[PDB]
C-alpha cells in the first residue's frame, strides 16, 4: 500500500507537528522523543494525514 | 578582542609563559597587543599566540632571541605525553 517514501514523509510531517505543539493522539511512555512518538502513532495506525495520488 | 581572564592564568609580568606549567586548549602562551585598526582608535588589538584549539600538554622551554632586524622573537615548545590508546597505528 504505502511506499517507503510516503511513510517517511508522513512520519516526518507528524513528528514536526508534534514538536511544534500538536497533541499526541495516543498515550506514550514518559521521556520519549517526538520522532519516536510519531513512529508510535504510525505503527498503531492512528494517522490523520493522507497522501494524494494522481 | 580581550579573551577571558581564565586564559591568562599562566602568564608572567613580562608577557611570557612560565616553563613547566600545564596548559589546555586555546590557552595564551605569549601575550601581545598590536596597534589598532582604522575600522578603532585609542585601542590595542589583542594578538596573543595561543595553543591550538584541541591540543594539550606542558610548556617545556621558552626562548627569547632577536630577529635579523633586531625585533624580539619568542619561541615556546609544548610537550604532551601520548600513552597508547584505541585508534593508534
Amino acid at each position: 500500500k504505502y511506499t517507503r517514501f510516503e511513510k517517511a514523509r508522513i512520519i516526518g510531517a507528524r513528528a514536526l507537528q508534534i514538536s511544534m505543539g500538536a497533541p499526541v493522539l495516543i498515550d506514550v511512555p514518559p521521556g520519549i522523543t517526538p520522532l519516536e512518538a510519531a513512529i508510535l502513532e504510525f505503527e498503531k495506525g492512528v494517522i490523520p494525514i493522507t497522501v494524494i495520488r494522481p | 578582542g580581550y579573551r577571558g581572564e581564565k586564559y591568562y592564568r599562566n602568564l608572567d609580568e613580562d608577557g611570557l609563559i612560565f616553563p613547566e606549567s600545564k596548559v589546555e586548549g586555546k590557552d595564551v602562551l605569549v601575550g601581545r597587543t598590536s596597534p589598532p585598526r582604522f575600522l578603532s582608535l585609542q585601542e590595542r588589538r589583542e594578538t596573543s599566540v595561543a595553543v591550538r584549539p584541541s591540543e594539550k600538554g606542558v610548556v617545556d622551554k621558552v626562548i627569547i632571541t632577536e630577529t635579523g632586524d633586531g625585533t624580539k622573537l619568542v619561541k615556546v615548545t609544548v610537550r604532551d605525553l601520548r600513552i597508547p590508546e584505541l585508534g593508534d597505528k
Binding site: S19, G31 | S34, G87
Partner: protein
Amino acid sequence: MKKVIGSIEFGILSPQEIRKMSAVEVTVPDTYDDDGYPIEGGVMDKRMGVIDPGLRCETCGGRAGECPGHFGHIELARPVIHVGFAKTIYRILESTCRECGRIKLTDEEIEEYMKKIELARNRRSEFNEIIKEIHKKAKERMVCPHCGAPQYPIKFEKPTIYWEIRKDEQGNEYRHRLMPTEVRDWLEKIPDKDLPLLGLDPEKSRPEWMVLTVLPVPPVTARPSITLETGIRAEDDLTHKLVDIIRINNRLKQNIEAGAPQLIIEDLWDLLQYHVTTYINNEAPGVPPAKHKSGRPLKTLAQRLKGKEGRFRGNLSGKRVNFSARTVISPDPMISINEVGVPVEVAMELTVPEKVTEFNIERLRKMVLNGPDKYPGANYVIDPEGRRRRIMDSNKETLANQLDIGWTVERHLMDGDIVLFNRQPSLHRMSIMAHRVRVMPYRTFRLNLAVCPPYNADFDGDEMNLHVPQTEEAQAEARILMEVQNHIISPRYGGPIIGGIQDHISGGYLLTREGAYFTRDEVEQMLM
C-alpha cells in the same frame, strides 16, 4: 507568504540596465587611504557595501556581516569587444549586409527557414544545426539580395580582431581592420524581424549589446580583501584587475581630451581591450595571461566558475557542513549492526535540538540541570521568542525552572539517536547509512564488523565521517529510509552485501564441521 523560484531566464545586460542597477560610478584607481578608510569614489567605495568592521554602507545601512553588496559601473571611454561573444559576433557579421543590416537571404527562403525554425526549436542541437545551415548559406553570397551593394569577406583573428578584405585600386585588397565602434554601428541597425534567423532573441538580447560600453563592477562583498598577518591588505585579484582597467580608461580619456596622435589612441584602445578580455577570462586563447606580483597567473571571473575548486563544483554541488565529526574507526563486534560507537568527547560537542513537550519535560529539565559538562547535559536553550541562551554554571537551576512548553534545548547526544555515517570515496549508495548512537569512553568510532563490506573499510588507519541531522523531518528520513538493516540486499545484483567475513566464516566452519562436540559449560557460555 514565501515564494520559490519557478524558472530562470537568461539574457544580456543592456547599458541602460547596468546604469540603472548601479549604485555609484567609479573614477579613482585606488582602494584605501593611508589610515585605512575606503577612498571616496574608489574601487572600494562604501556605496557598493562595507567589508571592514565598524562601517555602515550608506546605500543600505547594514554592517560588515549584514550589507549584501551593491553593483558599480565603469563608463568605458570607447567600446570594446566582449571576449565571450567574439565568435558569435564574427558569425553574425559575415551573414548580414553591410549597408541595410538585413540578413543576406532571399525572402521565400527566409519564409521556409522561419517555418523550419518554429518546428520545435527548443531542442538545442537541431536549432544549432539550422543556424549553422543559415550561416553557411549567408556566407557564400557576395551581393545582398535585399539591396544592391557588394559584400567583402571578413577574417576573424583571435581573440577579438576582425579584418575586412576590401579591394582597392589596381584590384588589390588591403585587409582593413574593423574598429569596435564600426562593428557596433554595423550590428545596431539589424532589424528585429530576422533576429531568430541568427539564433538570437529580440527581447532577451540584442546584437549591439554584445559590444559593451559600460562595465558593471561586482559588489565589495564579492571581492573580500584579506588583512595579511604582516599588517598589509592582500587585495583580491579582481580588485587589482579593476584598478588596472580604471587606470587605462582614465589615461585613454585624458589622451582623447588632449588630442593625442592616432597611433597612441589605437594602442591605448588595444591595451584596454586586452585588460578587459583578461578580466573577463584570463585563460582566453591567444593572449598572454596577466600575472600577479609574485608571477603567478591571476584568477578572474571565468576562473571562479570552472574547475573542481570553482563555484559550481566547489561551493554549490558540495560544501563544508556543520554538526559533523571525523576520527579513525576501530572494530566492535558487541554492538548491533545498526549501531555506531561514539566518543563521549564528540557526543558533548554535537547537539540535537529538541522541543519541550508534555511527554519529555522532565528529561530535558534534568539535562539542563546537568549543565554542559556532565555527559547527559545541554549547551543552549532557546526561548519561544527565539533568543539563544548559553547554559552556564550560574544559570543551570534558573534556566531549568524557566523551562516550559515551547522551549528548545540543544541537548547532548543520547543512546538511540540517529546519525549519518559515511566513508569516502562515496562510490555507491550504501556508502552512507544511518546508525543508532551508542556512547563510548574512548576516542574512536566503533563499527560492527559485518557492516565493513558496504563501506569497503578496514581498520588500518581509515577515517570515516559522521553527520547529525538537525530537523525532525530529516531525522525521520534517516530513520525510515537509511537504516542499515534495510540495505542488507545490494541493489546492484540482488544479493546480500552485509554478511559474515573472515573469522565469522571460519568459526562457523569450526562449529559445524564433522566431529565437533562441546561440553555443558561451553554450550551454556556460548549461548549466553
